[PDB]
Each structure stands twice: as C-alpha cells, then as structure tokens.
C-alpha cells in the first residue's frame, strides 16, 4: 500500500496511507510555531499547546478528557519553531470519535476566561520541567542569540508573560494562524476519500516577516561543574540543495552515538576532542534547518576548566574539513549514516506521520524515501567542503550554560 495526496483549492493538504493496521494516527499540522509570535504576544503558542482539552463549542473540557480516555486514545500537541502538530491515536473503530474531538480542539476552542486563567500556572510547571534539560537552556538561547525576530522566539513562554497570556491572544493566534492555507491533515489507517470530505466540510476556514539572522552570544553563568556550549553559523534553508550538504557534513563530523557506551571511532569531532582532553565530555555537530534559514555548528559538553580546549579543538576540526582534508570513505560513511538515519526515522508510524506532515507544510508534496536517498547521494565531496567553508567564514552565534570562567567568547576563538 502507498500514500495518497490532495491539495484543495483553499490551500489545505490531505495526505493518507490506508494500511489496514489496527491502530489509526491522524495529525493536523499547522504553520503556527513559536516564530509567529511577535514581541507583544510572546509565549502565546506555548499556552495554546497546553490549551487543547479546554472547552470547545461542540464538546466540554470534561467530554474531551473522558471521551478520549473512554476509547483508550491519546491527544498530543507538538510545537517546533515553525509548526504546531495536533495528533490523535486510537483503535481504528473510534477514529471519527477522535476526529470530532480533534476538529473541535483546533477549529472552535472557546478559551473561556476562567479556564484560561486556571491554566496559567501550567506554563510555569511545563517550562520548569523542560528547563531541567540543559540542552533546552542552550538551544533556546542559541536561537535568541542567532536571530533578530522569528526563529529567535523560544518555544517556552518567557517568565514575565506567565499569568498574562489573555483569552483574546489565544483567539487571535488561532484565528490568524489556524487556517486552510496553513494546514495539512495527515493520516494512517483511514481512507483518503473520507479524510478529504471531512477537510472540505469542517476544515475549510478562511485565511489570516522573514527571519533575520543576527549573530550574537548569550552566556548563562550558573556554576555547574559541566559547561554546555553551542557555536553555529548561518546554514541553508530546508528545501534547498545546499541544506543536504550540511546534513552530510553533520554526519562527517559526528552527529551522536551509534554504539552503546562506545568511543565513536568514526566521529571526526569526538576523536579530534578526545586527542587533547581525556576527562568526561561529549561533542556533536548541530544542524537545524528551517523554511527561511538554518543553523549549522557543534555543541560541546565539557568540564568547566576544559571548555576552552574542547570548543577550540572542535572548531579546528571543522576548519580542516573546510581546508579540504576529507576522503570519499568519510563522505560515504557519513551518507550511509544519514541514509540509514532517515529511513529509520520513518520506520515507526509515529515518525512517518511526522515526516509526511512536516514535508506537506514546508514543501508542496510528498517526496518518497527512495528519492531522498538519491538526493543524499547527489551531494559531492566538494559540496561538503563548501558547507564547512561557509561555517568557518560565517558570522557566528554562540550560547553557553555552566561555570563559564574558561568558556571563551566568540571573538576569543
């Protein structure tokens, strides 16, 4: 069985593979990520992510919870910087029950004053939890450092706005962003014709700047014995061919582990850093890629005293790749990793749904896995060296968290 695809005259995408599995995943993907906040409504999308299961027009707050739980189902809301994704799972017989709830949640939420206000403390709980990961500190700062406006926005609501996201703001955000022109309705274990008909009858809702890279640095001084740090330069927009080159460069340098408790013998960065410094550490290439822009670099985790040595060692490794020290066996291995990584990411029906929806928003239609692998192979050794060269000469953005006494500045590097 293979995927079906429709783009309606109103802009909306329907894509669905009927695979006759017992479970059915449906996802409504919306261009409504953190990037579409401005300085007046910061953290609105964060509250909105928490806010499904508040009362809707066709269903109460109570009914959304009880009705979904009744059939053993799940309703999740997932945000990137660029998209929001509302996902429902269940046993196939109850899809149109979950669908009714999903439509209510996305197309007619009431955002009642007392309910919206009751939800305010949840912003602090959710944020507090997320910011237990030091990766969350650094990546959120990194973007804030790297951009002037859209992508600079954090996924988590700024402290000052907690308790202050209004019902109006939630209504405005939905009314302005949750529209046919910005929506893709994706599904598994459900027929395409019935999805199309739902999208025509219940998801026909009428419509409602570019990310400026800056280059800055943000430094969280906090006295941990470990220093998390990330250094990136402007990369390439997703959809462009150059982006593929960065993805290969990421895997040349080393993009996370393959063996449990392993020493990463093929990772160019890990070995470059491990040559100089033997104490506990981790280093990885970082590659974000967006509609407008992208960030490529590396992330270090090092001892406080060794942060200087680790970052410089990692940066030096990219410089020699940019200078031209790069053989086919490396670029072949890197491709094999990325090729395997992609097919493995669409291996689960969860990740597959995410890629179908993800593509449908950022691009016109579905690119099959076989065509993607061919496009990875299309990256020549020269393209990888150019990506590295771009990084070396590019205006830098940096972020760190830890005891930064020996963490250098951008202009110290």
């Amino acid at each position: 069985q293979d995927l079906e695809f429709t783009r309606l005259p109103n802009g909306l995408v329907i894509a669905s593979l009927e695979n006759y599995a017992p479970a059915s995943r449906i996802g409504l993907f919306i261009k409504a990520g953190s990037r579409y906040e401005n300085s007046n409504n910061l953290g609105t999308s964060h509250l909105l992510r928490l806010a499904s299961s508040l009362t809707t027009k066709g269903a109460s707050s109570f009914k959304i919870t009880r009705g979904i739980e009744a059939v053993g189902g799940k309703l999740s809301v997932t945000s990137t910087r660029e998209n929001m994704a509302y996902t429902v799972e269940c046993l196939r017989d109850d899809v149109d029950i979950l669908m009714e709830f999903l439509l209510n949640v996305t197309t007619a939420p009431e955002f009642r004053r007392w309910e919206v206000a009751a939800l305010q403390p949840q912003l602090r709980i959710d944020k507090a939890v997320a910011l237990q990961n030091p990766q969350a500190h650094v990546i959120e700062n990194l973007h804030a450092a790297a951009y002037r406006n859209a992508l600079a926005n954090s996924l988590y609501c700024p402290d000052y706005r907690i308790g202050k996201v209004t019902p109006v703001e939630l209504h405005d955000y939905v009314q302005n962003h949750f529209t046919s022109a910005r929506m893709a309705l994706i599904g598994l274990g459900v027929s395409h014709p019935v999805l199309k008909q739902v999208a025509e009858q219940f998801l026909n809702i009428r419509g409602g700047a570019k990310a400026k890279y800056h280059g800055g640095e943000i430094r969280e001084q906090n006295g941990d014995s470990l220093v998390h740090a990330a250094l990136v330069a402007e990369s390439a927009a997703i959809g462009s061919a150059e982006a593929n080159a960065f993805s290969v460069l990421q895997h040349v340098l080393g993009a996370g582990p393959h063996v449990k408790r392993g020493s990463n013998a093929t990772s160019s960065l890990y070995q470059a850093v491990a040559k100089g410094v033997h104490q506990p550490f981790d280093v990885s290439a970082f590659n974000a890629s967006y509609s407008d822009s992208g960030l490529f670099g590396f992330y270090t985790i090092s001892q406080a005293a060794s942060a200087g040595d680790v970052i410089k060692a990692a940066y030096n490794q990219v410089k020699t790749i940019a200078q031209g020290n790069l053989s086919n066996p490396d670029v072949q291995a890197a491709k094999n990793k990325l090729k395997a990584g992609y097919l493995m990411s669409v291996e689960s029906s969860e990740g597959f749904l995410d890629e179908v929806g993800s593509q449908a928003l950022a691009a016109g239609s579905y690119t099959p896995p076989s065509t993607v692998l061919q496009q990875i192979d299309a990256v020549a050794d020269a393209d990888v060296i150019n990506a590295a060269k771009k990084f070396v000469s590019g205006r830098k953005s940096m972020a760190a968290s830890g005891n930064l006494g020996h963490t250098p500045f951008i202009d110290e590097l």
Binding site: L75, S76, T80, A130, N133, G256
Partner: protein, 46 residues
C-alpha cells in the same frame, strides 16, 4: 495510552553524570521540539 520514558517532577534534584559513556548522546544535534498531551508525560527533544 502508554506512559513516557521518564516521569517528570518539579522541585526534584536531577540525576548526576560522572563518566564519558553516560554523557554521550546528550550533545544536541537538531532544534528543539516540545510535546504536551492528555496521556503521555511532557518532554522536549533535540
């Protein structure tokens, strides 16, 4: 339906790292993703 890989508490001291072998995997390689749910515990991604 299924509970997450990790149960989340606020105000709870965090788990330590003392070696290379436990610290690898942690260096972020792709941008953040954030999920909240009805059934599954909230968690952020690289």
């Amino acid at each position: 339906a299924v509970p997450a890989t990790s149960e989340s508490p606020v105000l709870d001291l965090k788990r330590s790292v003392l070696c290379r072998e436990s610290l690898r995997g942690q260096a972020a390689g792709r941008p953040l993703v954030a999920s909240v749910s009805l059934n599954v515990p909230a968690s952020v991604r690289y």
